[PDB]
Amino acid sequence: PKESDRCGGCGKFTHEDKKNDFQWIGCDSCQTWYHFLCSGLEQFEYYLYEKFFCPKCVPHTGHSIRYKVVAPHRYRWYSPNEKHLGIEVGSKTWIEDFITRENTVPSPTDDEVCIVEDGYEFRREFEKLGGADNWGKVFMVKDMDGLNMTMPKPGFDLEDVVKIMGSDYEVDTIDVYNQSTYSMKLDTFRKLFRDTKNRPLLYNFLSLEFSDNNEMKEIAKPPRFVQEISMVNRLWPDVSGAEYIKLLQREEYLPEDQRPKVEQFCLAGMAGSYTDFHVDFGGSSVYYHILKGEKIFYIAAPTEQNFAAYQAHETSPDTTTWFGDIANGAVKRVVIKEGQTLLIPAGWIHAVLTPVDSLVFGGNFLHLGNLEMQMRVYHLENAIRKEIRSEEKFYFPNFELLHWMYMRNVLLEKITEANQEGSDMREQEKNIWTASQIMKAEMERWMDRELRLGPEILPTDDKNKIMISVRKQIEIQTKIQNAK
């Protein structure tokens, strides 16, 4: 073991092990090697410097020198081999240009988005359309009054967020011009955010999940109607005392570390930020409240035609074509301003431009009313992933497990209790019944798949036991229906 190969850390040859992985960076002065974690760099910085000067050398050497911006139209804006290549969506060059023709993309039809003045008008319009069980269009609610959506009072800003969460709290952050995600300290983000005049690179985080911060989780919550239809909320209720005890007695307890934690996000982005088209993971629905700033969403309805274009777009190696230009005019523009709230159901394809420095609270959720579309989006994701390669963390966490638990703990119980009486479920629970069949059919497919090529937390055996029990109760119920 040559002394050269010892980290000026940490002074070890192997880091103890966010994750250092097993990566080092060398100093371009003293030539000593550091583990990335011991180097003083954060992950977002790993590709920025042409010459890295370690902390010990900086005083006599100066700051690390970053690559020159050689190709602002490329994600590899620092590579001379890319100067002659096409303009990539959305490198800096692409975004600056997009900003000047952006307002020409058409407004939505009234079938696509309904704009309402406040949450009481929302409730009324929502109900006319059949409510959550038929939720198919997006809603923009100008004033939050009536939504029963707990939010911080204006004046609240990034400063309070960093104080509540902590300066060293790491968040997954988008490096906009590079279109990639890196870890960054909240304090480090705040600093870049404060300096409005000097922004070589733009940053936008979408993924600060705070449902486990005891202070934050009380300050920003989902609208009530969302808490009431959320499948995750149904399964991991934030309950206490005897309620909680009964949860334990019924074996309906579920580990906190198994909970998909996606219902309370904080988002902050610099002016000129752009997030490219996507469908939210698991085909979850979204609430999105703008506390400060302004967002422009570009959206396309979840039709088979749009999904085919989107799937092709996602799996194509091309990088120069804006999805909106191949989508046959499906893409619509919707501006959301400070104080306003967007409600998006399953499957909507959307990109978003951040015209102004922003602070947003939102969340993702699954619900029974959109179960078919949610599964259609799952299929869509699985198809795309067959082609490309993506990290698990960009998909809905424990998607399949959640449905096993929901079927076992929620649906099965209701069909069983129903069965032990009359008792036609169409007369008082048609929505529960139709959802059970949709979920069952999709779960049969998952079973089949598993028995053809093995598993990947819930043993194959337990799954089969649940299915057998579901089939039994379903066949029982339909016989109560072949009669009546």
């Binding site: 997954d172 990639s180 995600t181 979408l206 993924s207 996606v262 996507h278 939210d280 990290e391 963390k393």
Partner: peptide, 8 residues
């Protein structure tokens, strides 16, 4: 990692 909402 792709430029997209992240839930680890």
């Amino acid at each position: 990692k792709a430029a997209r909402k992240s839930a680890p």
